[PDB]
RNA sequence: CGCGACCUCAGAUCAGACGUGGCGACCCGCUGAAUUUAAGCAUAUUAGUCAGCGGAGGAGAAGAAACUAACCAGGAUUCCCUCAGUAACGGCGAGUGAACAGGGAAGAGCCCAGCGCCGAAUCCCCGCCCCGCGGCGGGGCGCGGGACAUGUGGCGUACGGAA
RNA sequence: CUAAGGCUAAAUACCGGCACGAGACCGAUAGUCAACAAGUACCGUAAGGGAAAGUUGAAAAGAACUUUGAAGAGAGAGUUC
RNA sequence: AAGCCUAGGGCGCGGGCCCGGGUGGAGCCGCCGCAGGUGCAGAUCUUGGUGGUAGUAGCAAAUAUUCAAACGAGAACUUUGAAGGCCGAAGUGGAGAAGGGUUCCAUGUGAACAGCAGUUGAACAUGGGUCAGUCGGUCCUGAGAGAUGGGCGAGCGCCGUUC
RNA sequence: CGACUCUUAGCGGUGGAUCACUCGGCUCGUGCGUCGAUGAAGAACGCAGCUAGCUGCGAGAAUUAAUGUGAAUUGCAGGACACAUUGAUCAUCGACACUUCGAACGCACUUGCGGCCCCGGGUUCCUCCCGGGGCUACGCCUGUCUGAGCGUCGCU
């Protein structure tokens, strides 16, 4: 009676939607059974069905997401949802290269006059 | 005493960690020593209590030589239940009076494939200290 | 209200000094923090001296002292030109170089 | 006042559901110390200044 | 029915059409003094209310 | 002891002419701690004498 | 007649529920708050009321976003990686 | 809950004489 | 009577980015009192302190002398001790009150404009190819655009430098 | 010495926050206002003010059942050292 | 064990202390030194509790209740029937606005409130109840408030509504 | 002997002092030292089978996914799981999601009115109407486009 997640990975979007909307049917029916009394077995099935909606809705929201960024992989201008979100400040930091550039004068100093490894008392 | 400066060693902090421990830590604290005969067969000093083990009672009012199966483990109140350890209520109903796992010796474990992998790894670590400490 | 031969004392406690009391309970922890960073500094430069570059022979101004010899800021360029070491090579080899130091004597 | 706004009626709806006695099965919990609700607002002494 | 608070008379009329394929003469809504919205959906005279109510589960 | 202990309240004493005896008391409110007494070592709550 | 008889003509109100601080302090006539200052861009706070600063501070509410930042801070700010599957 | 304070409220003032 | 450059100034739901607000123990820039003392009180003191305003950072600020010294001279800045309750200020009353040097912790120096010399030798953006792309970068190809002579880049900054 | 241009870590501070460690400290009128559903209940239109309230028992084993009373309440009986 | 009580035995001038009995169930005491948030009869002291007053003052503003029956264990106060009254259409009536926010309705209870009682209630526990193209809001503008431009302001921002 | 009143003792009442406990505060010390237009802090409203408050969560609402661990949660029912299966519960959490107000961002806060595109019912665009989605705030930088000038000029 369990709805897993591994078996839902290798299905189609429309079949999982068919797997989604049919589960909505008893979810509406279980809320009908709650106000009519019914039985304790159908009352505990509300939580099982509700968590199965989230499992199916996760996979739809999962598998749609890496199809967008795979299509957008390599594109310079990606949407803001796909962009890295570290902080407000870490997005405002350097470009991982721009602190590594030295001037023509700064590069001239280090190769001509490098920091020499040395020792004393001899 | 303790020499790692990150160890609690505090009256308030150790009791706070013990009483407010989550469920998977509560499995480890509720560990019971094995019987004498299993100790030379598994080389394991203690093992957490399980659902379908059977238990010899060590101390308490129910102390004796009876061997009874665990009914169910009640990890909120840090205690387990035994089939033949109970107490009749006023109205004739029977209530399982619990025994703490520290006063519990296990005669035989309820083995599964996730349990055999724990017997050997505790025994493997037992043999490291014997060889290194020789 | 002075009474029977005390000194005329002038304590500087008329400000709200209690908000700005600097306690020194950090002293043993600061000594470990400085020392553990000093050993870590010496381990990054494995053959180099832990104290750093060489300091020059420097006499005191202010004729009160007038005779003691200190460890200076750095060797002047007039001292380096005699020894034959260029001023941009002495920094890399472990010689303290400053351009401000004059040489009158 | 029979001329309430949408936020005011939505505010009074939540305060109405908070005025309800505690269920009986709370008292049989292990780590429980709640005896009564101790927050039962009534319309006579508590007047809900809005 | 009990209807979600952010609904609309156009959507409620279309919703009961989508679920239980019954046409609607008019839809009538109110907001109860408990937080939610109640709807009095009026059927066309060509369908029977208690016939379809047994399909819902309520009687 | 924290210097804010016994000073987070905002109390000043009622003036002369009432049956109370010149203690800094809590200002108003339908509360148990209302016109009780604070800012003294003799009162319940409040500051300790010569705080460490 | 300034006492009990003057309390009877208290019908209309001056403050309502603010939509930024939530307290009943939004003045109707001035069209402004003043527990927090709603029409002002900056939240109204003052250092002469230390108790009022801690009534609504950073540590008071839900941390529906900031507690993730604290939780992500000790973990290394990694993104796009997953734990190694079985 | 316990009420707000309202004691005996400042008894009747007298006339103030000269010299 | 218009077209075509240039300068100034607009409109954009133009293409791509940026700032707002909060916390605020520590810091920076302002503004800024009265309680209190002087047995009163007005200068003084409280005190550039409380309050108010703006701004960030994990540290900030400061920082490599238009310096200290008068010595047989020291040599960026920051912190501790000491100078020192001293020089000095003060109805010279209450009181306020540094700095040099020395011993330490740490210790790292540099870059421009100008002067000049190199064919703008420089930089930004759009399209194509290869690499890696979850802190959008490297190389190549484009009479593909723009900025720039109202000055970009290289050598080069007081310790001299350039040819 | 070279102002009216600029950059620069380290020794420095940290009653906010995260995770900790420790105490010749207080032990429920004390210690933070708050050891507990505490900036909660409550008060004032508002700025703001702001509490009281720890402990059954090893284990609920929380007194089955008889009798008076409508019941609250009792007498018995029973559990626990 | 601590703590508490004591018509018991006592010691020391005294601060106080040692035993006996009872309750209690888990830590505590002497000596040598050390340290303090260290000894209460008052402060119209703070908190909390309890007395005399005292079963006392009091439950007296607006003409008035009586008889029989029903429910119940219980009736001066509930309900029904009858009688006698009052509010007398500027009402003790029938409806609204502001305000109150489930107080509106049914069932059940009578533990706590309704300063007596209550089989009753606006008390409590269960549920239920407010349906709009035409009724209002929504639209318009008045007194006024308030952005942009503009000006001022160290500054949050301020002035002003056609300049 | 009475009744009433005072003291002491026992027992029983009001009261919660003392004592022993303590998942709590205070102080000091160490490491790190991280908010936000990719929507911060805060606030409102909802979410459990029975759920009032606290806490947690956001229409996927007492948590979804993955990793680790490995037989429970539990107050009462219930039912998944076979723990010979990514598998109950917990922690980690790196994937997804995150209602409304709020710097709050179409115009103002009454939750009312707008416009520009795309899609599905209306329709087979032919305009109404309905539903869903993406946009529409200010300040400012580079570049692009369209412009203005009895500004400086040339061509005419
Ligand atoms: Zn507000």
């Amino acid at each position: 009676a369990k709805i897993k997640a591994r078996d839902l990975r290798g299905k189609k979007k429309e079949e999982l939607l068919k797997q989604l909307d049919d589960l909505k049917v008893e979810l509406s029916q279980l809320r009908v059974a709650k106000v009519t009394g019914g039985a304790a077995s159908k009352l505990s099935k509300i939580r099982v069905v509700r968590k199965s909606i989230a499992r199916v809705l996760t996979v739809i929201n999962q598998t749609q997401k890496e199809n967008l960024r795979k299509f957008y992989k390599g594109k310079k201008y990606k949407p803001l949802d796909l962009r890295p979100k570290k902080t407000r400040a870490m997005r405002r930091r350097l470009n991982k290269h721009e602190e590594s550039l030295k001037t023509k004068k700064q590069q001239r100093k280090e190769r001509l006059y490098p920091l020499r490894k040395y020792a004393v008392k001899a | 005493m303790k020499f790692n400066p990150f160890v609690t060693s505090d009256r308030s902090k150790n009791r706070k960690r013990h009483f407010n421990a989550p469920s998977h830590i509560r499995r480890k604290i509720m560990s019971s020593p094995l019987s004498k005969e299993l100790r030379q067969k598994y080389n394991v000093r203690s093992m957490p209590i399980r659902k379908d083990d059977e238990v010899q009672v060590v101390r308490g009012h129910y102390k004796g030589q009876q061997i009874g199966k665990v009914v169910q483990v009640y990890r909120k109140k840090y205690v387990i239940y035994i089939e033949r350890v109970q107490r009749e209520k006023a109205n004739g109903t029977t209530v399982h009076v619990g025994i703490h796992p520290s006063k519990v010796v296990i005669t035989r474990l309820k083995l599964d494939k996730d349990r055999k992998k724990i017997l050997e790894r505790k025994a493997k670590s037992r043999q490291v200290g014997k060889e290194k400490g020789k | 209200a002075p009474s029977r031969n005390g000194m005329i004392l002038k304590p500087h406690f008329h400000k709200d000094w209690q908000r700005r009391v600097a306690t020194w309970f950090n002293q043993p922890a600061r000594k470990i923090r400085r020392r553990k960073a000093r050993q870590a500094r010496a381990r990054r430069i494995a053959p180099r001296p832990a104290s750093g570059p060489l300091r020059p022979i420097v006499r005191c101004p202010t004729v009160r002292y007038h005779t003691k010899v200190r460890a200076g800021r750095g060797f002047s360029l007039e001292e380096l030109r005699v020894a034959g070491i260029h001023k941009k090579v002495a920094r890399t080899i472990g010689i303290s170089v400053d351009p401000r130091r004059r040489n009158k004597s | 006042s029979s001329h309430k706004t949408f936020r005011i009626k939505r505010f009074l709806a939540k305060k109405q559901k908070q005025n309800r006695p505690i269920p009986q099965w709370i008292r049989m919990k292990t780590g429980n110390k709640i005896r009564y609700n101790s927050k039962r607002r009534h319309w006579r002494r508590t007047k809900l200044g809005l | 029915f009990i209807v979600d608070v952010k609904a609309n008379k156009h959507q409620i009329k279309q919703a009961v059409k989508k679920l239980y394929d019954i046409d609607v003469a008019k839809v009538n809504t109110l907001i109860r003094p408990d937080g939610e919205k109640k709807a009095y959906v009026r059927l066309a005279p060509d369908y029977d209310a208690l016939d379809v109510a047994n399909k819902i589960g309520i009687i | 002891v924290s210097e804010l202990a016994g000073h987070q309240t905002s109390a000043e004493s009622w003036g002369t002419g009432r049956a109370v005896a010149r203690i800094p008391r809590v200002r108003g409110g339908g509360t148990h701690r209302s016109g009780q007494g604070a800012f003294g070592n003799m009162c319940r709550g409040g500051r300790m004498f010569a705080p460490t | 007649t300034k006492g009990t008889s003057s309390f009877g003509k208290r019908r209309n109100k001056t403050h309502t529920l603010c939509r930024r601080c939530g307290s009943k302090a939004y003045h109707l006539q001035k069209s402004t708050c003043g527990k927090c200052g709603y029409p002002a861009k900056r939240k109204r706070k003052y250092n002469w009321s230390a108790k009022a600063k801690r009534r609504n501070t950073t540590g008071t509410g839900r941390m529906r976003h900031l507690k993730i930042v604290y939780r992500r801070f000790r973990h290394g700010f990694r993104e796009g990686t997953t734990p190694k599957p079985k | 809950p316990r009420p707000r304070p309202r004691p005996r409220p400042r008894p009747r003032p007298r006339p103030r004489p000269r010299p």
Side-chain angles (χ1 to χ4, degrees), chain A, chain B, chain C, chain D, chain E, chain F, chain G, chain H residues 1-3 5-7 9 11 13-19:
Chain A
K2 286 187 175 303
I3 293 299
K4 297 290 174 60
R6 291 172 315 296
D7 62 358
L8 304 192
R9 296 296 182 183
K11 308 167 70 54
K12 299 289 94 176
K13 185 161 309 181
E14 301 66 20
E15 301 196 80
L16 281 172
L17 286 192
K18 187 58 72 62
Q19 183 44 10
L20 194 173
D21 63 358
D22 63 358
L23 293 176
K24 282 286 195 65
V25 176
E26 69 275 16
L27 180 61
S28 66
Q29 193 64 330
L30 282 184
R31 266 90 58 89
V32 165
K34 186 176 70 176
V35 301
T36 61
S41 56
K42 301 188 295 293
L43 289 178
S44 72
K45 274 288 297 305
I46 279 178
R47 210 188 168 280
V48 183
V49 164
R50 272 190 58 243
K51 298 309 172 188
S52 66
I53 301 299
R55 289 199 190 86
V56 176
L57 273 175
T58 299
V59 176
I60 305 313
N61 279 308
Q62 278 289 141
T63 53
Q64 173 204 350
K65 182 64 69 177
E66 69 275 15
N67 298 343
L68 260 67
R69 55 173 75 257
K70 202 178 312 301
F71 182 76
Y72 274 139
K73 191 179 194 297
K75 188 54 209 63
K76 190 174 184 296
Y77 289 156
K78 45 196 62 180
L80 287 174
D81 283 8
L82 308 185
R83 291 190 187 186
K85 181 193 168 55
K86 287 166 166 290
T87 66
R88 174 59 164 274
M90 293 177 71
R91 280 174 283 160
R92 261 64 166 177
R93 283 196 310 153
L94 276 297
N95 199 0
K96 193 252 182 176
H97 186 32
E98 293 179 353
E99 68 294 338
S100 65
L101 284 75
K102 306 293 187 291
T103 70
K104 197 68 66 180
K105 188 186 286 292
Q106 183 34 30
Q107 280 178 296
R108 192 163 174 272
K109 284 182 171 143
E110 61 86 20
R111 51 154 160 81
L112 289 175
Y113 294 99
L115 183 63
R116 300 302 308 276
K117 192 183 180 74
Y118 64 92
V120 298
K121 155 192 51 193
Chain B
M1 71 275 298
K2 64 101 180 178
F3 295 84
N4 189 359
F6 299 134
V7 178
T8 62
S9 170
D10 193 358
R11 181 55 177 268
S12 296
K13 292 183 176 69
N14 282 124
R15 284 166 60 84
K16 187 183 181 59
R17 186 267 281 288
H18 176 268
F19 292 132
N20 288 318
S23 184
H24 78 291
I25 307 314
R26 281 157 171 269
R27 184 247 181 186
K28 186 161 85 48
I29 193 66
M30 281 205 278
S31 57
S32 176
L34 312 183
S35 70
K36 302 271 223 284
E37 293 83 3
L38 294 174
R39 273 177 53 178
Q40 67 255 8
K41 200 164 80 74
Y42 293 358
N43 211 302
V44 175
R45 186 49 177 272
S46 65
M47 185 64 72
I49 193 66
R50 214 203 163 277
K51 176 67 166 302
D52 291 331
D53 293 332
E54 81 305 336
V55 161
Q56 193 144 40
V57 189
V58 187
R59 311 306 190 104
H61 180 272
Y62 302 108
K63 145 187 61 182
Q65 293 82 17
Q66 293 82 17
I67 297 89
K69 189 173 260 315
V70 181
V71 179
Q72 65 97 26
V73 175
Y74 203 58
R75 313 218 296 207
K76 170 174 276 294
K77 287 214 292 275
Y78 276 118
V79 65
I80 66 171
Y81 290 154
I82 301 299
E83 42 175 330
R84 297 285 75 78
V85 178
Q86 70 275 16
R87 192 195 189 280
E88 65 183 1
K89 207 192 287 186
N91 48 3
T93 67
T94 52
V95 172
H96 292 337
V97 175
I99 301 299
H100 195 270
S102 66
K103 258 62 168 183
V104 169
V105 59
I106 298 194
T107 56
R108 174 260 320 290
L109 294 174
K110 189 255 182 177
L111 277 301
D112 80 18
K113 55 152 271 173
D114 278 342
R115 190 154 278 258
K116 271 80 73 175
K117 65 176 295 301
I118 301 299
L119 311 181
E120 51 76 23
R121 74 171 300 91
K122 280 198 175 189
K124 184 212 321 173
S125 65
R126 272 297 293 264
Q127 296 294 321
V128 179
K130 303 296 189 294
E131 274 186 60
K132 183 247 198 171
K134 189 181 184 303
Chain C
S3 300
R4 283 187 288 180
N5 215 3
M7 294 183 286
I8 307 304
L9 311 165
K10 302 291 192 65
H12 295 77
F13 286 164
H14 294 296
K15 299 184 189 179
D16 185 330
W17 61 276
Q18 273 164 320
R19 294 301 320 310
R20 301 172 297 273
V21 171
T23 61
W24 276 52
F25 306 117
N26 264 307
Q27 182 175 20
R30 191 213 305 276
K31 279 159 77 76
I32 301 299
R33 278 190 291 117
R34 280 165 165 169
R35 167 186 153 82
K36 275 190 174 298
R38 196 170 301 117
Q39 312 204 290
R41 178 173 184 273
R43 293 200 285 114
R44 289 166 314 109
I45 61 170
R48 302 176 192 82
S51 61
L54 182 63
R55 301 295 171 174
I57 301 299
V58 175
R59 207 188 303 276
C60 287
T62 62
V63 76
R64 168 177 193 181
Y65 293 111
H66 199 242
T67 43
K68 302 320 161 43
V69 174
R70 313 186 291 105
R73 169 67 150 81
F75 285 88
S76 85
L77 311 173
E78 195 281 300
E79 299 155 328
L80 285 163
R81 70 181 68 250
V82 179
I85 297 89
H86 190 270
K87 68 191 195 72
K88 294 180 180 177
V89 191
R91 186 86 37 72
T92 61
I93 193 66
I95 297 169
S96 314
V97 180
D98 62 358
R100 279 183 298 270
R101 267 201 57 238
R102 75 185 69 88
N103 282 67
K104 309 180 61 53
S105 69
Chain D
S1 85
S2 186
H3 282 285
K4 323 163 186 55
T5 72
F6 185 51
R7 44 201 171 241
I8 282 299
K9 192 175 173 181
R10 204 151 50 71
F11 198 83
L12 300 177
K14 183 175 174 66
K15 314 302 311 173
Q16 193 184 100
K17 293 187 286 185
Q18 293 179 356
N19 189 359
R20 205 271 301 261
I22 62 170
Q24 183 66 41
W25 52 273
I26 301 299
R27 194 151 311 141
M28 283 73 74
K29 278 176 177 290
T30 80
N32 199 6
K33 64 202 71 53
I34 300 170
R35 331 187 191 211
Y36 46 95
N37 196 26
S38 82
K39 288 182 173 189
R40 290 294 301 283
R41 166 193 61 88
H42 191 271
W43 59 275
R44 295 218 86 152
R45 293 72 61 210
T46 317
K47 301 304 295 183
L48 277 188
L50 301 198
Chain E
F1 293 100
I2 300 299
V3 176
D4 186 74
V5 289
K6 274 183 300 190
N8 189 359
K9 272 181 183 178
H10 296 304
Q11 314 157 331
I12 297 155
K13 181 185 174 66
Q14 203 44 20
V16 298
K17 171 60 72 174
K18 192 75 180 65
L19 277 296
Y20 293 99
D21 64 358
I22 61 171
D23 54 35
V24 172
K26 68 179 179 182
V27 63
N28 189 359
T29 61
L30 61 83
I31 298 183
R32 304 150 40 121
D34 285 326
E36 61 275 60
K37 166 180 290 188
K38 190 201 295 181
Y40 290 104
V41 58
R42 161 71 173 276
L43 294 174
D46 62 357
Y47 292 100
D48 186 74
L50 61 83
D51 189 315
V52 65
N54 264 27
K55 323 291 301 205
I56 311 300
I58 48 175
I59 185 53
Chain F
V1 190
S2 59
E3 69 275 16
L4 274 297
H7 285 307
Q8 295 163 126
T9 61
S10 179
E12 62 267 31
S13 69
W14 299 346
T16 300
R18 304 157 88 167
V20 304
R22 302 209 303 216
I23 294 299
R25 282 156 205 277
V26 193
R27 314 191 50 71
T31 317
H32 271 149
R33 194 172 173 85
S34 56
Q36 272 191 354
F39 288 169
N41 54 341
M42 61 285 297
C43 305
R44 185 190 177 275
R47 155 197 60 260
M48 65 179 288
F49 162 73
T52 58
Chain G
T1 61
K2 83 190 79 167
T4 306
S5 68
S6 292
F7 277 109
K9 45 184 69 68
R10 290 189 161 192
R11 305 157 43 196
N12 56 338
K13 299 173 174 184
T14 58
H15 305 91
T16 187
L17 281 193
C18 183
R19 64 185 296 163
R20 188 165 70 89
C21 68
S23 43
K24 199 208 79 192
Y26 184 80
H27 195 186
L28 272 300
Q29 289 186 292
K30 299 198 304 179
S31 178
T32 187
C33 186
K35 180 69 180 294
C36 74
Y38 169 71
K41 290 180 168 54
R42 296 155 180 271
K43 163 179 171 295
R44 162 196 175 274
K45 68 183 312 193
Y46 292 111
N47 303 265
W48 44 258
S49 58
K51 193 183 284 257
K53 285 168 63 182
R54 79 203 191 208
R55 283 207 190 90
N56 62 6
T57 187
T58 285
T60 303
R62 286 189 46 187
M63 300 284 78
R64 67 187 312 179
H65 166 248
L66 194 72
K67 77 163 61 172
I68 306 175
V69 177
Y70 293 170
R71 181 168 74 69
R72 286 209 283 115
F73 163 69
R74 66 174 67 92
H75 205 55
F77 274 61
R78 294 179 292 173
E79 311 166 30
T81 61
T82 60
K84 178 189 68 179
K86 289 183 74 72
Chain H
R2 297 189 198 180
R6 187 44 54 227
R14 70 184 178 260
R16 323 206 326 176
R18 287 296 191 179

